[PDB]
Design a protein around this ligand. Structure first.
Ligand SMILES: *[C@@H]1O[C@H](CO[C@@H]2O[C@@H](C)[C@@H](O)[C@@H](O)[C@@H]2O)[C@@H](O[C@@H]2O[C@H](CO)[C@@H](O[C@@H]3O[C@H](CO[C@H]4O[C@H](CO)[C@@H](O)[C@H](O)[C@@H]4O[C@@H]4O[C@H](CO)[C@@H](O)[C@H](O)[C@H]4NC(C)=O)[C@@H](O)[C@H](O[C@H]4O[C@H](CO)[C@@H](O)[C@H](O)[C@@H]4O[C@@H]4O[C@H](CO)[C@@H](O)[C@H](O)[C@H]4NC(C)=O)[C@@H]3O)[C@H](O)[C@H]2NC(C)=O)[C@H](O)[C@H]1NC(C)=O
Ligand SMILES: *[C@@H]1O[C@H](CO[C@@H]2O[C@@H](C)[C@@H](O)[C@@H](O)[C@@H]2O)[C@@H](O[C@@H]2O[C@H](CO)[C@@H](O[C@@H]3O[C@H](CO[C@H]4O[C@H](CO)[C@@H](O)[C@H](O)[C@@H]4O[C@@H]4O[C@H](CO)[C@@H](O)[C@H](O)[C@H]4NC(C)=O)[C@@H](O)[C@H](O[C@H]4O[C@H](CO)[C@@H](O)[C@H](O)[C@@H]4O[C@@H]4O[C@H](CO)[C@@H](O)[C@H](O)[C@H]4NC(C)=O)[C@@H]3O)[C@H](O)[C@H]2NC(C)=O)[C@H](O)[C@H]1NC(C)=O
Lengths: 208, 211
């Protein structure tokens, strides 16, 4: 009976309206004995606002069981540690796992939008590029929007270690050449802990 | 022998397979050859046919007090690019049966990358350093080589992202070259070179300069 501990999603830790959650999912719990207790700790203290979802049989007839702990944005961003502690009857030792935010002095990313190259204008789909460089540590969120809705067709590289010890990444958003040619404005939104309000937005549109 | 000698098979480097003036090599490396049983025999096979052009290196002693033997098979660019299988067979009397390893190019229909160069953002023109971007878009499979040069010489203060899987099943990546604002101001020309099996001549080069 083995444990997996998942951290809150970056964007949930960065925007205070959202709810960051730490997840403790126990997998491979027998029919034999299947009951399982969850106790949660922040810097070694007992918390009791965990919402635990009932046992779930897979096809592996083996049961999965999830305890979700809601956390405070500042506690996570300040580096506090979260331990999940699981008590099954199916092994003597109640067994445990910790996580916390990755360490490192925050570095503020620079965000730059780049129009498509003139060679791509022969195609009827074109690429809009968002470059995010100089950030540390690497937990980040990047998204594209237009006129207040999210834009589907994009993909973001994973962070890449630059020469100066900071990270960079690129996000490519693909759109119809027509929408670009009509002067539609597209925004790159970036969320990172070293930004003011943890948020910035840079716009991009067909220039005159 | 540690838990017996063990074998590792290394493919050629992509660039060597793609430029025909370079020499692509498959390398078979055997480690943990005991002092009691120090002889090792390589047999090479390409699509199940033995070849005899391999170049076997002496036999070098490691600090664990145990041997390392390397054999090097030169391969044909087009044989590798056509998907042929390379097979190393290693015999040593510390082993009950000979060990064999197989290697070959990543499979799948090739697709040609498009290469676009993007100048630095106007907002970056405040800083001392600016970023020149090479977008390489739509390629399959993912083995690729991307380099930056200026006046024939490499630049090397650049980083390439790994291939990212795109929505249409192909890959793309970006290559970022960081340059002194002054060299970009002077009109210095920079060039992104790409090597990939679906390019004409396996090669292309896109240039950008100021204005
Ligand atoms: C019975 O069948 C079920 C059915 O589930 C199956 O799920 C997938 C994999 C498909 O096969 C489905 O078709 C199928 O239905 C089995 O359930 C699976 O069990 C395995 C093993 O127990 C788990 O694999 C582990 O995965 C986690 C990370 O998984 C996330 O991403 C998965 C995509 O691959 C996704 O499917 C998962 O749902 C999970 O998603 C997370 O969900 C949480 C909460 O819901 C959420 O917060 C997140 O949004 C989301 N996160 C992500 C990233 O998507 C991982 O823990 C495991 O990796 C460990 O082991 C490797 C060995 O080293 C290593 O590569 C990893 O780094 C990690 O290793 C540990 O890492 C750290 C250091 O970094 C350290 O603590 C440790 O020292 C180190 N080493 C070890 C040994 O721990 C592994 O990849 C599946 O996730 C799980 N599926 C689901 C849906 O839960 C079940 O196991 C079967 N029973 C049997 C065989 O008995
Ligand atoms: C005794 O000593 C010897 C000699 O080692 C040297 O001397 C001692 C005294 C120390 O000082 C050492 O530090 C020193 O290295 C030991 O021999 C070592 O044995 C281990 C295994 O026990 C081998 O590990 C394998 O490593 C390869 C990658 O190795 C490259 O990179 C190393 C640097 O990181 C470098 O040291 C190697 O020389 C080799 O370098 C490459 O060389 C080629 C040509 O020679 C060159 O073209 C390349 O440019 C160059 N590259 C680099 C980066 O330098 C690794 O691939 C293996 O991983 C596979 O196997 C693992 C299990 O064995 C598995 O966990 C992995 O996931 C991985 O699995 C593979 O996955 C791929 C992809 O999916 C798949 O295609 C494969 O089928 C699959 N293969 C397998 C087997 O599953 C592996 O980790 C060391 O290379 C080797 N060292 C040397 C120098 O040869 C020995 O261990 C010592 N024994 C005792 C008892 O002490």
């Amino acid at each position: 009976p083995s444990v997996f501990l998942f951290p809150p999603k970056p964007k949930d830790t960065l925007m205070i309206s959202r709810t960051p959650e730490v997840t403790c999912v126990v997998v491979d719990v027998s029919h034999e004995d299947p009951e399982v207790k969850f106790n949660w700790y922040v810097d070694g203290v007992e918390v009791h606002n965990a919402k635990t979802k009932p046992r779930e049989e897979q096809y592996n007839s083996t049961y999965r069981v999830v305890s979700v702990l809601t956390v405070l944005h500042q506690d996570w961003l300040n580096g506090k540690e979260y331990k999940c502690k699981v008590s099954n009857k199916a092994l003597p030792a109640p067994i445990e796992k910790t996580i916390s935010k990755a360490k490192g002095q925050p570095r503020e990313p620079q965000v730059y939008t780049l129009p498509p190259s003139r060679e791509e204008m022969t195609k009827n789909q074109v690429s809009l590029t968002c470059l995010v460089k100089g950030f540390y540590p690497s937990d980040i969120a990047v998204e594209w929007e237009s006129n207040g809705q999210p834009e589907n067709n994009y993909k973001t590289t994973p962070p890449v270690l630059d020469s100066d010890g900071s990270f960079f990444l690129y996000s490519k958003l693909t759109v119809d050449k027509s929408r670009w040619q009509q002067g539609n404005v597209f925004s790159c939104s970036v969320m990172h802990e070293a930004l003011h309000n943890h948020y910035t937005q840079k716009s991009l549109s067909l220039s005159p």
